[PDB]
Amino acid sequence: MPVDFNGYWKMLSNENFEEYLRALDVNVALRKIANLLKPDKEIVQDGDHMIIRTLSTFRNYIMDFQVGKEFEEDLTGIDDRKCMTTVSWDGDKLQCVQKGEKEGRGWTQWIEGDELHLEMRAEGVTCKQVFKKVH
């Protein structure tokens, strides 16, 4: 059953993000800036169609996709690499593979109550982010 992500979700915690960005070959200044920044996720869900807006004062990162489709994702801000990205529905878990340069590149996102729980992977290394629903 595909879970309803429609809303504005504010960050509670950010765990292992400097090690995830070091696994993408990112500079030390952008690792310290992006681990100090707490973004707001605005998600608009329409069945398989999804707009995920990761909102911040330094850079806003918007992912627009249909679940099912392998799309051209430029990760502009993070590392600036083009991945062939396929996102699939496992009921509660929204499960993604990013096809390109890195070993086991992807992400898994799910709802626990009012909390969005995100795992992001690059070269095995998993960053864990928690966001609470407010509007």
Ligand X SMILES: CC1=C(/C=C/C(C)=C/C=C/C(C)=C/CO)C(C)(C)CCC1
Q: With binding defined as CB under 6 A, does residue 9 bind ligand X?
A: no
Min dist. Cβ of residue 39 to ligand X (A) = 4
Give the residues across from 52 on adjacent strands. Answer: 43, 63
Q: With binding defined as CB under 6 A, does residue 51 bind ligand X?
A: no
- Report yes or no: 101 and 123 within 8 Å, Cβ to Cβ: no
Q: With binding defined as CB under 6 A, does residue 122 bind ligand X?
A: no
What is the C-alpha to C-alpha distance for residues 131 and 30, in angstroms, rounded to an integer? 21
Q: With binding defined as CB under 6 A, does residue 125 bind ligand X?
A: no
Any binding-site annotation on 63? yes
Min dist. Cβ of residue 50 to ligand X (A) = 8
Min dist. Cβ of residue 53 to ligand X (A) = 9
What is the C-alpha to C-alpha distance for residues 110 and 113, in angstroms, rounded to an integer? 10
> What single-letter DSSP state applies at residue 68?
T
- Report yes or no: 67 and 88 within 8 Å, Cβ to Cβ: yes
What is the C-alpha to C-alpha distance for residues 26 and 9, in angstroms, rounded to an integer? 26
Q: Which residues sit at the interface with ligand X, rule CB under 6 A? A: 34, 37, 39, 52, 54, 56, 58-59, 61, 63, 77-78, 107, 109, 120
- Residues of each annotated binding site for all-trans-retinol: 41, 63, 109
